[PDB]
Amino acid sequence: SMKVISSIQELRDQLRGQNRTAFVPTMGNLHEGHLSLMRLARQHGDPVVASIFVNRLQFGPNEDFDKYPRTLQEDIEKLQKENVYVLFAPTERDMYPEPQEYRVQPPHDLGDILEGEFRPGFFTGVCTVVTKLMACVQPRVAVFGKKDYQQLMIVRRMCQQLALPVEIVAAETVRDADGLALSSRNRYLSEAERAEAPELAKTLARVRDAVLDGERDLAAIERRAVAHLSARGWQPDYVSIRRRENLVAPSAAQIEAGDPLVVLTAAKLGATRLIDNLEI
Amino acid sequence: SMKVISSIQELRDQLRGQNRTAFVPTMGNLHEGHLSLMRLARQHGDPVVASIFVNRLQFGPNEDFDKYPRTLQEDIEKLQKENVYVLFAPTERDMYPEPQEYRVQPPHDLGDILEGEFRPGFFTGVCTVVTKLMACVQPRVAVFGKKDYQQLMIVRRMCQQLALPVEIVAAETVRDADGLALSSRNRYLSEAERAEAPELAKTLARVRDAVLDGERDLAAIERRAVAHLSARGWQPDYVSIRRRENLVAPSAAQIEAGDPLVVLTAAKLGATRLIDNLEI
Numbered sequence A, B: 001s002m003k004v005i006s007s008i009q010e011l012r013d014q015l016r017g018q019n020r021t022a023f024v025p026t027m028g029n030l031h032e033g034h035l036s037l038m039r040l041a042r043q044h045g046d047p048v049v050a051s052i053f054v055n056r057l058q059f060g061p062n063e064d065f066d067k068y069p070r071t072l073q074e075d076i077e078k079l080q081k082e083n084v085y086v087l088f089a090p091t092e093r094d095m096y097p098e099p100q101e102y103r104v105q106p107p108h109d110l111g112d113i114l115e116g117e118f119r120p121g122f123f124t125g126v127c128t129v130v131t132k133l134m135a136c137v138q139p140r141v142a143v144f145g146k147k148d149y150q151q152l153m154i155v156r157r158m159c160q161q162l163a164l165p166v167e168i169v170a171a172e173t174v175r176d177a178d179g180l181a182l183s184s185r186n187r188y189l190s191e192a193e194r195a196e197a198p199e200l201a202k203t204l205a206r207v208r209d210a211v212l213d214g215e216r217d218l219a220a221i222e223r224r225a226v227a228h229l230s231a232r233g234w235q236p237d238y239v240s241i242r243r244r245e246n247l248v249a250p251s252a253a254q255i256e257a258g259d260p261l262v263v264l265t266a267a268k269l270g271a272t273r274l275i276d277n278l279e280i
């Protein structure tokens, strides 16, 4: 029987003595992408612990904290079917009984680019809540999705640099039949927006092919991709082809030596901000 | 510059003393799928050696050996952009100067199911040519794609069971913008068929979703998916949900335990036989 636990102390009592816990943090409103992570966690540890917490610290004042989808009863029903031992679903009073004034700050060269330039402070909000959730759960492993590629790398290096004894396991991005990367925010899209939304992944597939087919001027590829999206009524923040190892743009020499690359993008359809990426 | 070599003895002299070679065998008419594998190979060894050879042994008399696309000069131009040190492109007199009568035979149970049920003797043709290619190139590593998932498992077990000192590295499937797995045989499809062909991958995504969402009657999912493709004018051979470890159907107990699964399909669109799979 799955335990739903809001209290930090109760969570510690339930997990007392567990040395192989696999942890999957989420913000709830569960879809097939989350469920895929739950299944992967079970191959890497036991028991599997899920968290559902919408973290105010990683939302900016002009973002979507108040309308973020919240469907805890259904989330519970889904987790029950996937052999998950504990759901940690703290209230905001449990996680933040007084305002949070201790923060985990990531490196400037990694936290302030890409998602960090367009969402100032975002990864301070993420690193702070993830450190806290790991200190509550004390897992051996934690599963993060490649869908939030920058996040995944930030959390990996956080654990290493803060000496947290947690191994990070990366999960592949789960997509809808039409190629759109699954996200609770996909719910915000109108019918017309939903029909256009798959164009973001298609654009990534086309930039992938151009790199594989030998095009060396990466910035020109990025610019064409941005213009293609803009002409169809998107407002892109970026399309950026970077090294997987440090999310820096490769030099000419690194392009020739075939350093593994990833193309990352974020782009709005109306007020809804979608992100996706494709390893190359 | 890339060396293109036809003679086995010359290949041996070129690769003499190389203990870290990564090998990528292909049947030519190269597309972005193959190029992806070349890039991955470079991460796992050096030099990267490609081969291009249409293998008569893995085509039945009613299949497409004579029409199989051959575009060697294009293939050479594409490989030159991917850092590839040697193309091994033997003629049929180079590989088979007399009829091939020594054959490597895989187990029945692996074997004669799925692709081997619908293409009798296929994996004997594959295991034979692959063994021969490995003996010619003598790589440390060889890269095979998940697109041919059953092939990938068959070649891995083959190497371990014949004590071939070659590590198999698996590559993720590369799909088109529209989700269709790239294959040199995509060429065969009419335009109408090309527009329908993404439905295979879409059907796999929905099978995946049904399993993740908790449907335990896997045979029922399989039957719907088959019936779905038929109603749309496909001739399906199979849609089958198997365990990744051994390609056997899981017991109810193994479903409950979350043994990693994969859904596999093969289906005809007119005369063209397409295959695809998705890890669940």
Ligand SMILES: Nc1ncnc2c1ncn2[C@@H]1O[C@H](COP(=O)(O)O)[C@@H](O)[C@H]1O
Pocket: A025, A026, A027, A028, A033, A034, A037, A143, A144, A145, A146, A147, A148, A171, A172, A173, A174, A175, A181, A182, A183
């Ligand atoms: N479509 C997806 N495929 C794989 N992982 C995902 C997907 N969507 C979200 N995730 C991951 O699920 C975890 C929680 O996501 P969220 O619920 O957005 O906080 C994170 O590790 C995300 O990267």
Ligand SMILES: Nc1ncnc2c1ncn2[C@@H]1O[C@H](COP(=O)(O)O)[C@@H](O)[C@H]1O
Pocket: B025, B026, B027, B028, B033, B034, B036, B037, B143, B144, B145, B146, B147, B148, B171, B172, B173, B174, B175, B181, B182, B183
């Ligand atoms: N679309 C694809 N994505 C990834 N690998 C592929 C793809 N198509 C073919 N391959 C692999 O590339 C190699 C050569 O395939 P082929 O040229 O069909 O014999 C095999 O290891 C295939 O599984």
Ligand SMILES: [Cl-]
Pocket: A028, A052, A054, A070, A071, A072
């Ligand atoms: Cl909630």
Ligand SMILES: [Cl-]
Pocket: A244, A260
């Ligand atoms: Cl990687």
Ligand SMILES: [Cl-]
Pocket: B172
């Ligand atoms: Cl990968």
Ligand SMILES: [Cl-]
Pocket: B244
């Ligand atoms: Cl696997």
